Design a protein around this ligand. Structure first.
Ligand SMILES: [Cl-]
Ligand SMILES: [Cl-]
Ligand SMILES: [Cl-]
Ligand SMILES: [Cl-]
Ligand SMILES: [Cl-]
Ligand SMILES: [Cl-]
Ligand SMILES: [Cl-]
Ligand SMILES: [Cl-]
Ligand SMILES: [Cl-]
Ligand SMILES: [Cl-]
Ligand SMILES: [Cl-]
Ligand SMILES: [Cl-]
Ligand SMILES: [Cl-]
Ligand SMILES: [Cl-]
Ligand SMILES: [Cl-]
Ligand SMILES: [Cl-]
Ligand SMILES: [Cl-]
Ligand SMILES: [Cl-]
Ligand SMILES: [Cl-]
Ligand SMILES: [Cl-]
Ligand SMILES: [Cl-]
Ligand SMILES: [Cl-]
Ligand SMILES: [Cl-]
Ligand SMILES: [Cl-]
Ligand SMILES: [Cl-]
Ligand SMILES: [Cl-]
Ligand SMILES: [Cl-]
Ligand SMILES: [Cl-]
Ligand SMILES: [Cl-]
Ligand SMILES: [Cl-]
Ligand SMILES: [Cl-]
Ligand SMILES: [Cl-]
Ligand SMILES: [Cl-]
Ligand SMILES: [Cl-]
Ligand SMILES: [Cl-]
Ligand SMILES: [Cl-]
Ligand SMILES: [Cl-]
Ligand SMILES: [Cl-]
Ligand SMILES: [Mg+2]
Ligand SMILES: [Mg+2]
Ligand SMILES: [Mg+2]
Ligand SMILES: [Mg+2]
Ligand SMILES: [Mg+2]
Ligand SMILES: [Mg+2]
Ligand SMILES: [Mg+2]
Ligand SMILES: [Mg+2]
Ligand SMILES: [Mg+2]
Ligand SMILES: [Mg+2]
Ligand SMILES: [Mg+2]
Ligand SMILES: [Mg+2]
Ligand SMILES: [Mg+2]
Ligand SMILES: [Mg+2]
Ligand SMILES: [Mg+2]
Ligand SMILES: [Mg+2]
Ligand SMILES: [Mg+2]
Ligand SMILES: [Mg+2]
Ligand SMILES: [Mg+2]
Ligand SMILES: [Mg+2]
Ligand SMILES: [Mg+2]
Ligand SMILES: [Mg+2]
Ligand SMILES: [Mg+2]
Ligand SMILES: [Mg+2]
Ligand SMILES: [Mg+2]
Ligand SMILES: [Mg+2]
Ligand SMILES: [Mg+2]
Ligand SMILES: [Mg+2]
Ligand SMILES: [Mg+2]
Ligand SMILES: [Mg+2]
Ligand SMILES: [Mg+2]
Ligand SMILES: [Mg+2]
Ligand SMILES: [Mg+2]
Ligand SMILES: [Mg+2]
Ligand SMILES: [Mg+2]
Ligand SMILES: [Mg+2]
Ligand SMILES: [Mg+2]
Ligand SMILES: [Mg+2]
Ligand SMILES: [Mg+2]
Ligand SMILES: [Mg+2]
Ligand SMILES: [Mg+2]
Ligand SMILES: [Mg+2]
Ligand SMILES: [Mg+2]
Ligand SMILES: [Mg+2]
Ligand SMILES: [Mg+2]
Ligand SMILES: [Mg+2]
Ligand SMILES: [Mg+2]
Ligand SMILES: [Mg+2]
Ligand SMILES: [Mg+2]
Ligand SMILES: [Mg+2]
Ligand SMILES: [Ru+3]
Ligand SMILES: [Ru+3]
Ligand SMILES: [Ru+3]
Ligand SMILES: [Ru+3]
Ligand SMILES: [Ru+3]
Ligand SMILES: [Ru+3]
Lengths: 173, 173, 173, 173, 173, 173
């Protein structure tokens, strides 16, 4: 029962896109959790909260765009549970930034494995899709998180609550 | 280690709000799945797709607002996995509408159990919260879905593909 | 044959809402009658007439909103005759105001009995509905009518036709 | 005790205008009932609902204008109970339209009997009033309802739920 | 000698509202005192001063609204002395914030006792009043003060005069 | 421990300004009480109510300005309880106006004693302050209240409820 639209779209690619959909939903969920950590009355860094909420919404958009892709190509979306984040308590602004950096590196590695697969299956439409909409976004995200981690370290986080407060106001404000 | 803000907020209520957060995320996920079903090339009802996407985004907002509430009250958010939806293939516009109706009735029952709990624990702030932001939204959603199911039936869905097409254009367009 | 939308909505509540619909229509009719009393050539207080017409239209809106509620909840509207008002001739501006005060107190008592019923049947949606759209409107109406009755008395109504005339121009104008 | 304004206004005319006031209130009530039938979750034709609500409000205005007339002429308004409509359940859009057609024909017959009376009592002001504000409005209403009934029949109502749905969108939308 | 407007309004509720009026005036007075502490030449934190002045004005408004309520319901306002605040010298920005947090928790407890009373006397209008205009305002105030106390602590107040200065500029500015 | 700013500011002046702060708060409280008297359903003179509310807010501003002065000069604010007003029930519009006149004369006498003190202590800054911001405001307030009392008397208050009603509309409206 093949889709009338399907062309040059390997089953392995189809499956790999479904996995990537789950990973983008998971990254949305991590960032949601981080957001509301910083909204706790005992953490209380509102621009950290807003920053990660925005990232959360971005990752949901990234998921949606892969769902759209799956249907554009005539594959079939298969959803899996979205796992809860590894931590409930993210410790400090610095530790959350470090965790986001690791998350985005993990997501980039997935994307790079997906692009290898697409390359191996000679799917230039999928290669272009990944390159256009995902790989440079990931390089920018990683670089931004790296920059944030550096500033926080240099300022004396996580031990200086002053450092995290002023970063919240100047960089994320 | 009690929150400095916490007042008149029972542990049972705290836990019940965490459960409700998960249920709202789950409802967002159901609607996401339904949305992209209708975007499939072999279904191809774009206003059904847009309608459920909007509902999906609404449920995410409902979840966020409960997270905000949890922190406002000094409870602690505890996230759980977001289960995949029961179906991958929703059959027809009518069947998806019927499923959404059942979902929203289920969510309303949860909210009503939460309100009972709040009432039992004499938490009028929580009672007001639920009444203001959730109970009439649920009554309107249910009523809207009921109306949609009726129209679709009366028009001859799910067997008339014409019925579903014209409903898509006139009611959801 | 239960409505697909109905949930947590007791038959007693359903019936009580139908009674309240009739009472709001009746209050609209009382105010209509009062309005046109003041439009008589031998009464001739045009702002009393406009004031009660507006109240009449308000009560019709209150009825409509309860009809909407009945359907939102999946109950079935059952209409009864709208009784004529008790008086054809309302005597004076003061006496009409006094009668309106008594009418609004009667309507408030009905609403309060309805809210008791809803509370007894653990229907927080209905409780919220009544509180949001009816109970403070009734407290404001009562207070306004009380104020009007006082001013009229203090000014020397109903014996001073001058008092009623100047109240018409200054308070209702 | 005759009104200072009264002139050429027969007691029979006075009474007949009071009857007509009641009939216009009754027609408002019929249309109100029909409106909210179509707002039921198991009927769910929102432009039928809006259409009859508007008609309901129009009939209330027609009543008010006769009340105004009664006082302009120095007659005395005497109100009677507004009877509930004959049906609670109006069956279908077609059947409601048919019922409205019959209602408006009934109201027109009353108006025509009133005009005969006025003619017999040589009251040209009342004749003009009826002709100017009522008789052509009734001829237009009747003609409009006839047209609606025809279209619905021709489209295959009441058995085609599709017909009623598309009429709702195209003619009443 | 009962008020013509009074209905379903228990004497105990009446008295409890008078007590709450005094408590809101007292909270206005505390915040006034705190405001002008920060305007002292040896304290000199102008946005702390403005912040508490605004809170002071808010509490006066809360008092006024309860006075309005008392009259709306036909109770009789009975005023008592407004006690001076417990401290003349509030120590530091952090200590004032901590004191405000405790004050607002105290006021919330009063409101919650008032709502219990209203619930016990089956006064849903009063329940709604308290829920609508007071309980969520108190939850937001408490949460805001908690957040402020946290930031100040984390920044190194009250020992760091730098911390209090920069908080004044970034959070309260 | 003298303030770094303090110069030519006698301890007696400092104390006298604290007393005057209390008197201005007390006058705010009197006017608040009077305001809400006229908002009672059995008094019901809304422009009397608004008039005294505005006066109440003005007196609070006068207090604030003295607090500001105390700090400008390097004195230390010391607050005392704000006594409840002498009356709960102010009788009539005329009697309230008479009471306000006496209150403002009392406040003026205090200000004049303060100015004597400042003169005796050769504090021309304080003299100027009092003259600029308080003495002519008091002369205008007194004159205005005198005028109001006269009109009310001349119109036949407090026995004519008509007089008080029309004054409310024409002078305070
Ligand atoms: Cl293929
Ligand atoms: Cl393949
Ligand atoms: Cl799974
Ligand atoms: Cl890019
Ligand atoms: Cl970059
Ligand atoms: Cl770039
Ligand atoms: Cl608690
Ligand atoms: Cl607990
Ligand atoms: Cl889990
Ligand atoms: Cl809502
Ligand atoms: Cl609705
Ligand atoms: Cl609604
Ligand atoms: Cl039910
Ligand atoms: Cl039942
Ligand atoms: Cl009946
Ligand atoms: Cl309201
Ligand atoms: Cl009011
Ligand atoms: Cl109000
Ligand atoms: Cl006048
Ligand atoms: Cl005649
Ligand atoms: Cl005759
Ligand atoms: Cl009758
Ligand atoms: Cl016409
Ligand atoms: Cl026509
Ligand atoms: Cl025509
Ligand atoms: Cl009572
Ligand atoms: Cl009592
Ligand atoms: Cl006292
Ligand atoms: Cl609020
Ligand atoms: Cl908040
Ligand atoms: Cl909020
Ligand atoms: Cl800075
Ligand atoms: Cl000095
Ligand atoms: Cl000295
Ligand atoms: Cl004291
Ligand atoms: Cl001046
Ligand atoms: Cl002057
Ligand atoms: Cl002047
Ligand atoms: Mg926050
Ligand atoms: Mg991002
Ligand atoms: Mg992503
Ligand atoms: Mg797990
Ligand atoms: Mg962890
Ligand atoms: Mg981590
Ligand atoms: Mg690019
Ligand atoms: Mg950078
Ligand atoms: Mg598409
Ligand atoms: Mg929704
Ligand atoms: Mg929801
Ligand atoms: Mg599973
Ligand atoms: Mg299935
Ligand atoms: Mg299902
Ligand atoms: Mg309640
Ligand atoms: Mg609401
Ligand atoms: Mg609908
Ligand atoms: Mg007229
Ligand atoms: Mg009204
Ligand atoms: Mg009403
Ligand atoms: Mg009868
Ligand atoms: Mg009578
Ligand atoms: Mg009466
Ligand atoms: Mg309200
Ligand atoms: Mg009033
Ligand atoms: Mg509807
Ligand atoms: Mg019509
Ligand atoms: Mg008519
Ligand atoms: Mg009958
Ligand atoms: Mg029938
Ligand atoms: Mg019929
Ligand atoms: Mg014409
Ligand atoms: Mg036509
Ligand atoms: Mg200053
Ligand atoms: Mg506040
Ligand atoms: Mg307050
Ligand atoms: Mg003391
Ligand atoms: Mg102290
Ligand atoms: Mg303290
Ligand atoms: Mg609210
Ligand atoms: Mg905050
Ligand atoms: Mg008032
Ligand atoms: Mg003044
Ligand atoms: Mg003053
Ligand atoms: Mg005393
Ligand atoms: Mg006294
Ligand atoms: Mg006095
Ligand atoms: Mg001088
Ligand atoms: Mg001057
Ligand atoms: Mg003057
Ligand atoms: Ru690392
Ligand atoms: Ru079902
Ligand atoms: Ru009475
Ligand atoms: Ru026929
Ligand atoms: Ru504490
Ligand atoms: Ru005197």
């Amino acid at each position: 029962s093949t889709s009338q639209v399907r062309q040059n779209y390997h089953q392995d690619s189809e499956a790999a896109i479904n996995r990537q959909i789950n990973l983008e939903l998971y990254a949305s969920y991590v960032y949601l959790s981080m957001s509301y950590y910083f909204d706790r009355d005992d953490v209380a860094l509102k621009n950290f909260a807003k920053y990660f909420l925005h990232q959360s919404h971005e990752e949901r958009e990234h998921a949606e765009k892969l769902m759209k892709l799956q249907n554009q190509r005539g594959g079939r979306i298969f959803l899996q549970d979205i796992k809860k984040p590894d931590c409930d308590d993210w410790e400090s602004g610095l530790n959350a930034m470090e965790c986001a950096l690791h998350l985005e590196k993990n997501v980039n590695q997935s994307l790079l494995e997906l692009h290898k697969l697409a390359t191996d299956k000679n799917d230039p439409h999928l290669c272009d899709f990944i390159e256009t909409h995902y790989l440079n976004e990931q390089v920018k995200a990683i670089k931004e998180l790296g920059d944030h981690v550096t500033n926080l370290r240099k300022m004396g986080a996580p031990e200086s609550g002053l450092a995290e407060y002023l970063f919240d106001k100047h960089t994320l404000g």
